[PDB]
Design a protein around this ligand. Structure first.
Ligand SMILES: CC(C)(C)OC(=O)N1CC[C@@]2(C(=O)Nc3ccccc32)[C@@H]1c1ccccc1
Ligand SMILES: CC(C)(C)OC(=O)N1CC[C@@]2(C(=O)Nc3ccccc32)[C@@H]1c1ccccc1
Lengths: 227, 227
């Protein structure tokens, strides 16, 4: 019938916390990694602000962040993708050739753009994006998760809220919410391709910095301090 | 409520769906399981022919969908016949966790399949829900090397629509069942990712020609489609 006042507060808390998330070939690669570093730090600070993340064991908190960080970034990329200019903004704006010039393969870049256009067609507002990020963080099937049951339980409220929210925004379009959730399936494959991209960069004498190598290369000391 | 036109479709899908070497020694046990995998792959291609619209797509795409889907369909089938009373997972070739471990499968791969199966069991899926979930899995637009993603997404929508409508009728009060079912598709991508690592580990300690076509890093797969 309608959103429950308890959810309205929770949604509104999530979007507000999110809006505070703001700074304005090897050299090109080394540039992008510093952008990745800043965004990772913003995500961990955001993850602290989500209800219940703090409650979990650090080992699980790490396990969720390692896997989630690439997918949250790809969601953020999709949110600020401009279909009028074909540029992705981090107001650090970049085109497809800028990503190619830094050593990223075309098999990885083109799908991110295709993913972004598909996300654009769904017409997601900030509340939908915020809830999608919460659902993404609390994924029970991430590797090396000690307490999958607790993680699944923390996810349910955000899936419930997202269901209720999508029903109010577009009552007639029932298939929007299923299609949104099916983008989570696409983020897993794009995360899988990203690991191949990392390895392909190593071949081109392009190795990751210390924070990013903790999460993406294959004792997360850097990641503990921020938590 | 459901449209009777869908109903025939569901009923056709469920009906279509309902239709070896000695087990001892590790290599013999492994060689046993591969022959079970061979038979099940052949059953899936015959099933894929019976799904409406699969035949209409180009062979190159038909291959691309089957390569990726086969592991996920098998894991769905494993979950369907997982027994929580006995912890055991062909017609009645029953196996326990130690049987899988004895054949050289690592525990990092076995335990998640069981955890996945228990999670699937908690959802309480009937044969219609399983059947529709399999159809949705086959028609995934973001599989690698797909020439016609638009047509694949279009063939998927009716099954997602049917699954939505079906789940609403079966349990009107439990709204979160359908979202949780679709989120299992996300879990199948990671389990497919782990399965590729499992295959490589084993080579380290080699698959039969048919599987190696689908899983190792296409003549058999064409003949089954050409019939
Ligand atoms: C190269 C490093 C390791 C820093 O970055 C990545 O490997 N990636 C992976 C995801 C990423 C993103 O967020 N947008 C986007 C668009 C196209 C390709 C790659 C990406 C990000 C990324 C790429 C470029 C700039 C910032 C982040
Ligand atoms: C490596 C080989 C080819 C043997 O098999 C697989 O790689 N797999 C991967 C998926 C599989 C299955 O279908 N059920 C199940 C349950 C536990 C573990 C593994 C599986 C299957 C599989 C395993 C055992 C028997 C038949 C199929």
């Amino acid at each position: 019938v309608q959103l429950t006042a308890a959810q309205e507060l929770m949604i509104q808390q999530l979007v507000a916390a999110q809006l505070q998330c703001k700074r304005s070939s090897q050299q090109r690669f080394a540039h992008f990694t510093e952008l990745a570093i800043i965004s990772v730090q913003e995500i961990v600070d955001f993850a602290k602000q989500v209800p219940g993340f703090l409650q979990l064991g650090r080992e699980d908190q790490i396990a969720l962040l390692k896997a989630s960080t690439i997918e949250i970034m790809l969601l953020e990329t999709a949110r600020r993708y401009n279909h009028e200019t074909e540029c992705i903004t981090f107001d650090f704006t970049y085109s497809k050739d800028d990503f190619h010039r830094a050593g990223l393969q075309v098999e990885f870049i083109n799908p991110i753009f295709e993913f972004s256009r598909a996300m654009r067609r769904l017409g997601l507002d900030d509340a939908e994006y915020a809830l999608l990020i919460a659902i993404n963080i609390f994924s029970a099937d991430r590797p090396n998760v000690q307490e999958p049951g607790r993680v699944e339980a923390l996810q349910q409220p955000y899936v419930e809220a997202l269901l209720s929210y999508t029903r109010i925004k577009r009552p007639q379009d029932q298939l929007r919410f299923p299609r949104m959730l099916m983008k989570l399936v696409s983020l897993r494959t794009l995360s899988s391709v990203h690991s191949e991209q990392v390895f392909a960069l190593r071949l081109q004498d392009k190795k990751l910095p210390p924070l990013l190598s903790e999460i993406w290369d294959v004792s997360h000391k850097i990641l503990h301090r921020l938590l």
